[PDB]
């Protein structure tokens, strides 16, 4: 089928991956085993696409590529490992031949920076702060196993070149130079905004992978909420990553609820969801990025599935906004997908309260949406005595609710 | 113990809150001195859309005398002289008096209230 047509088309390859199984995944695992030993951007596109293929023999090469100076590729590997960890237990069942080297590299990415008490909270490292309001130890390398290099920002030498110089100048403990490399590339990053942000995102992804499969602490939830509450609006990617990390963590739930504020109609998460919904409904309000909205709804679903979260979504009255979504949202594939997510969330809530749903006339709204989608199919297939997949999933979840 | 309910609320306790398809009423509304595009009518529909299920039901009781929703829809709304549709008449008396209902005609008389808030307040006090 069209999967086979896409394969034949791919089998300008990099131009097609930029536009966007066995022998295509094998050519990919090829170039993975080749690049890690006009190259880096091919690896990045291979990764960015593979993180879609798994979402509907690479583990070793991916851990080998998680050890790279360029953060783009680290982020891509992390995003692929997030996809695997979140949707199937592919790396959890794996043997300790490479599962442990992976989880240890992830731990060395994830491990704390000192949070708010010491001056290295996640929120602060996303605002610029002029580079003079952070602790002076941010550009200080103190590897002890005893290396105490300082001002790695002043030093302009490539990070990998510095690591190589350290490798030769000192005998670094075998099979654990990774924690040095991650400290050095962090201390190079923190000097500048893009690299600080990328390291923050990498740490967040590493957490989430390490939890879908010592890193977590009392301040982490607050710090993530603070990342969300940043008003810059240029950090949507970071905010989405933070929300995904919170979703992982949920898999402390009372603290997540107390911080996000879901117990009251006025609260950061409820207000944020309502704004996202209004921007999705009304053209005038700028639509919140698709990824961010996806993360928000996924968080809501993953919360509602727990009784404390479903009771909080009762308390803040999210059923009214979600029925607003299922009533006024359009017909386009992304909007269909948001409607499906909303219906699933409503189903998870109505598994413990009915009064809100009934009071909001929810059954009428569901039936009207089912009529509207069947009427939009009626144009393609008017006979009465293939469907677009997203609409079929909508119909399916809504009939399951009925 | 029953005396805590009103005469509306006792009906809503025995027979339950109906779900009012305000869109069905709008599709079966007749405007006599107002028009379907009169500004007082857009304010009326905004108010009635903003009322909760209980205030919608209390409105339905106020204008039809019952919470019963007709199976065929409000097109089949009966009155004193045969099938009577719901109906909104402009009350040309002073606009310092409440709306008034004639349930046998399913008739609302509505003063030309100067604002959304005042019309909504008076209607909510009526229901």
């Amino acid at each position: 089928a069209d999967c086979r047509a896409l394969i034949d088309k791919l089998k300008d390859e990099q131009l097609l991956l930029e536009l966007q199984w066995v022998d295509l995944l094998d050519r990919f695992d090829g170039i993975l085993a080749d690049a890690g030993q006009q190259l880096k951007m091919l690896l990045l596109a291979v990764l960015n696409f593979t993180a879609l293929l798994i979402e509907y023999s690479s583990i070793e090469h991916l851990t080998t590529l998680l050890a790279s100076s360029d953060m783009q590729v680290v982020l891509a590997v992390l995003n692929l490992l997030y996809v695997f960890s979140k949707r199937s237990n592919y790396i959890t069942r794996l043997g300790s031949d490479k599962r442990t080297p992976l989880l240890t590299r992830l731990q060395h990415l994830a491990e704390s920076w000192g949070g708010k008490e010491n001056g290295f909270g996640l929120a602060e490292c996303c605002r610029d702060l002029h580079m003079m309001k952070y602790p002076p130890s941010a550009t200080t390398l103190h590897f002890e196993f005893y290396i105490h290099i300082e001002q790695l920002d002043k030093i302009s030498e490539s990070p990998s070149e510095i690591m190589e110089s350290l490798t030769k100048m000192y005998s670094i403990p075998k099979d654990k130079q990774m924690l040095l490399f991650t400290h050095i590339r962090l201390a190079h990053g923190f000097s500048n905004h893009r690299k600080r942000l990328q390291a923050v995102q990498a740490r967040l992804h590493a957490i989430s992978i390490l939890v879908y499969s010592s890193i977590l602490y009392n301040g982490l939830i607050e710090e993530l909420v603070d990342v969300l509450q940043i008003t810059d609006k240029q950090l949507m990617e970071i905010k989405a990553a933070s929300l995904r990390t919170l979703t992982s963590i949920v898999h402390k739930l009372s603290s997540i609820i107390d911080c996000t504020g879901t117990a009251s109609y006025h609260g950061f998460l409820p207000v944020l969801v309502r704004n996202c919904i209004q921007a999705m409904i009304d053209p005038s309000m700028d639509p919140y990025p698709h990824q961010f909205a996806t993360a928000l709804f996924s968080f809501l679903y993953h919360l509602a599935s727990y009784d404390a979260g479903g009771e909080a979504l009762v308390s803040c009255g999210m059923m009214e906004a979600l029925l607003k979504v299922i009533k006024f949202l359009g017909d386009e594939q992304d909007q269909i997908t948001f409607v499906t997510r909303a219906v699933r969330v409503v189903d998870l809530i109505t598994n413990l309260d009915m009064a809100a749903f009934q009071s909001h006339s929810g059954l009428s709204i569901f039936i009207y949406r089912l009529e509207h989608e069947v009427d939009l199919c009626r144009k393609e297939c008017p006979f009465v005595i293939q469907c677009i997949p997203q609409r079929a999933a909508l119909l399916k979840s809504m009939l399951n609710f009925l | 113990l029953i005396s805590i309910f009103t005469e509306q609320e006792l009906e809503l306790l025995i027979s339950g809150l109906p779900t009012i398809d305000i869109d069905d009423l709008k599709s079966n509304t007749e405007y006599h001195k107002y028009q379907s595009n009169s500004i007082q009518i857009q304010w009326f529909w905004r108010a009635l859309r903003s009322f909760d299920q209980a205030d919608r039901a209390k409105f339905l009781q106020f204008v039809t005398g019952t919470s019963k929703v007709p199976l065929q829809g409000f097109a089949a709304l009966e009155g004193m002289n045969g099938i009577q549709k719901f109906q909104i008449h402009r009350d040309d008396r002073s606009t310092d008096r409440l709306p008034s209902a004639h349930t046998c005609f399913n008739q609302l008389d509505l003063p030309a209230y100067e604002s959304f808030e005042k019309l909504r307040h008076m209607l909510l006090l009526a229901i």
Side-chain angles (χ1 to χ4, degrees):
Chain A
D2 55 12
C3 324
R4 288 200 183 64
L6 290 163
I7 296 155
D8 278 353
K9 292 161 197 174
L10 285 158
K11 193 184 187 177
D12 191 59
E13 175 192 357
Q14 62 260 334
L15 281 50
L16 296 174
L17 295 170
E18 280 175 26
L19 283 165
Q20 283 166 321
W21 297 112
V22 185
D23 59 286
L24 184 58
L25 299 176
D26 282 331
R27 180 174 162 82
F28 294 164
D29 282 79
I31 188 155
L32 299 188
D34 185 317
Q37 309 295 355
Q38 60 286 306
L39 309 88
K40 293 179 179 179
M41 188 66 239
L42 286 67
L43 176 66
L44 291 165
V46 164
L47 289 170
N48 282 282
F49 187 69
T50 306
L52 293 166
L53 291 177
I54 284 74
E55 183 178 2
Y56 302 92
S57 86
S58 59
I59 271 287
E60 282 62 26
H61 319 331
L62 282 174
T63 89
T64 305
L65 288 157
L66 177 63
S68 183
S69 327
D70 177 15
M71 261 286 173
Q72 288 302 353
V73 175
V74 185
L75 266 180
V77 169
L78 285 161
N79 188 9
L80 203 159
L81 294 167
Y82 176 64
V83 155
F84 270 123
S85 69
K86 183 178 179 180
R87 276 180 255 157
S88 63
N89 75 320
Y90 168 74
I91 68 168
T92 302
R93 71 182 291 196
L94 181 66
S96 44
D97 303 336
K98 212 72 183 176
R99 187 173 175 236
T100 56
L102 179 60
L103 288 186
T104 58
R105 280 179 178 67
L106 296 185
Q107 278 168 71
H108 306 346
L109 283 164
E111 63 156 60
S112 187
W113 304 353
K116 297 194 158 197
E117 45 281 21
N118 310 127
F120 285 114
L122 279 168
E124 293 177 350
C125 318
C126 290
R127 291 197 314 289
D128 304 66
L129 295 298
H130 321 305
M131 193 52 282
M132 279 287 175
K133 292 202 293 170
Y134 292 116
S137 58
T139 50
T140 278
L141 188 147
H142 182 318
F143 192 31
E144 202 170 23
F145 51 83
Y146 158 53
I147 323 196
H148 185 83
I149 320 198
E150 293 177 350
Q151 294 300 320
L152 288 304
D153 171 13
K154 293 179 179 179
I155 308 192
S156 163
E157 203 177 50
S158 295
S160 202
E161 293 177 350
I162 303 200
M163 174 51 206
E164 279 285 43
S165 71
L166 300 211
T167 321
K168 291 204 207 312
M169 278 194 294
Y170 303 76
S171 92
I172 319 174
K174 300 81 158 147
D175 213 358
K176 293 179 179 179
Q177 312 90 349
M178 291 308 305
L179 182 67
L180 169 67
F181 181 59
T182 206
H183 283 216
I184 188 66
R185 77 188 170 192
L186 190 148
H188 265 63
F190 213 93
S191 149
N192 187 35
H193 204 205
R194 301 186 195 119
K195 308 171 196 175
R196 200 180 321 123
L197 284 160
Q198 272 158 44
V200 153
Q201 206 188 157
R203 161 173 171 213
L204 286 188
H205 273 69
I207 291 154
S208 319
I209 303 156
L210 295 168
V211 180
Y212 270 97
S213 72
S214 40
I215 285 66
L216 303 174
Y217 59 94
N218 186 274
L220 193 52
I221 285 53
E222 293 177 350
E223 264 155 52
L224 294 159
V225 173
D226 294 27
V227 181
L228 287 173
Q229 300 195 230
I230 298 317
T231 40
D232 309 330
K233 221 278 194 189
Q234 293 177 335
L235 316 173
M236 283 314 187
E237 26 174 24
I238 318 310
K239 296 171 197 184
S242 150
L243 260 172
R244 286 193 260 97
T245 284
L246 269 176
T247 301
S248 74
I249 296 172
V250 168
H251 299 193
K252 310 196 186 304
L253 185 57
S254 56
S255 73
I256 293 182
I257 292 158
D258 184 32
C259 302
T260 57
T262 60
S264 45
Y265 180 85
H266 298 264
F268 184 62
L269 178 63
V271 172
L272 183 57
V273 176
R274 274 152 32 210
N275 299 2
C276 205
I277 286 172
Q278 196 68 31
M280 256 154 53
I281 290 159
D282 200 304
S284 61
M285 270 182 66
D286 57 340
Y288 282 12
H290 167 285
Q291 158 186 243
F292 180 45
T294 287
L296 258 171
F297 282 83
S298 306
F299 174 80
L300 285 180
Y301 179 95
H302 287 106
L303 210 90
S305 38
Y306 294 98
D307 181 18
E311 282 182 11
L313 298 178
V314 172
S315 301
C316 57
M318 283 284 104
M319 201 91 70
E320 176 169 338
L322 294 173
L323 293 168
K324 206 184 167 172
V325 170
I326 305 160
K327 210 204 305 197
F328 298 113
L329 265 194
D331 301 358
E332 291 80 1
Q333 292 189 358
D334 289 345
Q335 291 166 269
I336 294 165
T337 289
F338 297 126
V339 185
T340 299
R341 311 186 85 102
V343 170
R344 307 272 321 252
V345 177
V346 159
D347 184 1
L348 287 177
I349 308 161
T350 58
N351 276 9
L352 66 86
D353 188 37
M354 311 311 300
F357 183 84
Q358 186 64 14
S359 310
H360 303 122
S361 74
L363 206 69
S364 189
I365 288 151
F366 273 40
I367 289 158
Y368 160 75
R369 194 71 198 209
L370 177 63
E371 177 189 20
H372 176 69
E373 296 316 332
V374 171
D375 290 30
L376 289 162
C377 298
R378 199 96 65 169
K379 305 187 194 292
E380 295 302 320
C381 187
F383 174 71
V384 176
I385 287 158
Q386 210 78 32
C387 191
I388 186 167
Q390 294 106 327
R391 185 172 287 123
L394 176 51
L395 295 163
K396 188 182 297 172
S397 67
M398 203 143 53
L399 292 164
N400 275 301
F401 180 95
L402 293 173
Chain B
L1 197 51
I2 205 66
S3 77
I4 74 183
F5 299 95
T6 68
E7 57 270 38
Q8 298 96 347
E9 289 169 48
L10 178 57
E11 182 183 301
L12 306 180
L13 185 68
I14 290 165
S15 58
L17 292 284
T19 294
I20 290 150
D21 194 68
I22 296 176
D23 284 87
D24 212 338
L25 291 163
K26 181 177 171 282
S27 303
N28 294 289
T29 301
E30 295 171 327
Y31 311 97
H32 286 267
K33 296 167 177 183
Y34 292 123
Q35 296 98 66
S36 76
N37 48 326
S38 156
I39 185 57
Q40 283 75 23
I41 301 306
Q42 318 321 321
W43 290 338
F44 163 74
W45 294 112
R46 189 181 170 214
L48 182 60
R49 288 178 186 286
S50 83
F51 293 155
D52 53 345
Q53 54 269 359
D55 285 337
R56 292 176 184 196
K58 288 174 179 179
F59 173 70
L60 186 65
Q61 287 170 307
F62 185 73
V63 302
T64 306
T66 189
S67 74
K68 191 181 186 179
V69 176
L71 187 71
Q72 302 101 57
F74 292 108
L77 189 67
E78 299 207 75
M80 179 172 283
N81 44 297
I83 322 305
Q84 176 50 54
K85 275 186 179 168
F86 161 72
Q87 62 180 314
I88 312 176
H89 298 235
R90 180 170 142 147
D91 187 358
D92 296 300
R93 302 180 296 163
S94 66
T95 192
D96 217 8
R97 77 192 56 245
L98 293 169
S100 201
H102 301 113
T103 67
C104 73
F105 305 121
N106 308 302
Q107 177 176 329
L108 178 62
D109 219 38
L110 173 58
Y113 298 117
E114 72 282 62
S115 71
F116 175 69
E117 267 68 57
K118 183 45 63 188
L119 184 147
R120 190 183 192 262
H121 286 149
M122 295 287 188
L123 179 61
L124 193 47
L125 278 170
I127 71 168

